[PDB]
């Protein structure tokens, strides 16, 4: 089961273009669409209505939603927490030099970190919460995206606006914190 995950990570990193269309600027932006798409599905299921995308210093991406939280219960299949099984089959995780999850669920904050899809430690309880949702922070792997790992605000802005227009009732916010002296935000909420 865990042998199958490792071969999956090797497959994705060996032929990344077969998975995300290209390793160009187009492929770098595709990472964000892959994560945001999961949060939109949680909203269409009726459980989330807010998504926030932050370009952080050094072109980290953080996506946050107010969904149920990715589940943390032990799979009978992997013997591992569900969230670990979901993220260690994620293309985004495989093509990120680092990725972090924080889950707010069961009044608990759970945390795991990964490098090229490989968990760095077991899922751990780190805090308490009265909210539910998921935070993902990732840094695209410079070894995969050799052309650029720099996001284009206007590219993200155009697609986030389109997603909010198509999926009415979802508040979707983009914020660029790369320059701490000049922070730019656009927030879309149709109907
Ligand atoms: C940023 C973000 N948010 C989510 C997210 O909230 N996903 C989420 N998935 C799930 C989920 O599915 C488990 C695994 N898969 C089912 C079949 O499609 C794909 C997911 C179950 C529950 C629940 O049973 O309470 C909650 C949740 S909340 C994911 Cl994944 C990412 Cl990445
Ligand atoms: Ca889905
Ligand atoms: Cl759970």
Swiss-Prot record:
Where is the protein situated, by its record's location annotation?
Cytoplasm
The lineage's top-level taxon is Bacteria
Quote additional remarks. Answer: Few gyrases are as efficient as E.coli at forming negative supercoils. Not all organisms have 2 type II topoisomerases; in organisms with a single type II topoisomerase this enzyme also has to decatenate newly replicated chromosomes.
Question: What does the similarity note say?
Answer: Belongs to the type II topoisomerase GyrB family.
Summary of subunit composition and partner proteins: Heterotetramer, composed of two GyrA and two GyrB chains. In the heterotetramer, GyrA contains the active site tyrosine that forms a transient covalent intermediate with DNA, while GyrB binds cofactors and catalyzes ATP hydrolysis.
Function, as annotated, reads:
A type II topoisomerase that negatively supercoils closed circular double-stranded (ds) DNA in an ATP-dependent manner to modulate DNA topology and maintain chromosomes in an underwound state. Negative supercoiling favors strand separation, and DNA replication, transcription, recombination and repair, all of which involve strand separation. Also able to catalyze the interconversion of other topological isomers of dsDNA rings, including catenanes and knotted rings. Type II topoisomerases break and join 2 DNA strands simultaneously in an ATP-dependent manner.
Identify this protein by name: DNA gyrase subunit B
């Amino acid at each position: 089961g865990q042998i199958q995950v490792l071969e999956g990570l090797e497959a994705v990193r060996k032929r990344p273009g077969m998975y995300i269309g290209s390793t160009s600027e187009r492929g770098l932006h595709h990472l964000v669409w892959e994560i945001v798409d999961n949060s939109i599905d949680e909203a269409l299921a009726g459980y989330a209505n807010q998504i926030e995308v932050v370009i952080e210093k050094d072109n980290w991406i953080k996506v946050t939603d107010n969904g149920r939280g990715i589940p943390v219960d032990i799979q009978e299949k992997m013997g591992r927490p569900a969230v670990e099984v979901i993220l260690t089959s994620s293309v985004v995780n495989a093509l990120s030099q680092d990725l972090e999850v924080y889950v707010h669920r069961n009044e608990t904050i759970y945390h795991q970190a990964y490098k090229k899809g490989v968990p760095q430690f077991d899922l751990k309880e780190v805090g308490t919460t009265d909210k539910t949702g998921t935070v993902i922070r990732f840094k695209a792997d410079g070894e995969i995206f050799t052309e650029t790992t720099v996001y284009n605000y206007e590219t993200l802005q155009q697609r986030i606006r389109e997603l909010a227009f198509l999926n009415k009732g979802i508040q979707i916010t983009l914020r660029d914190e790369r320059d701490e002296e000049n922070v730019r935000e656009d927030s879309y909420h149709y109907e």
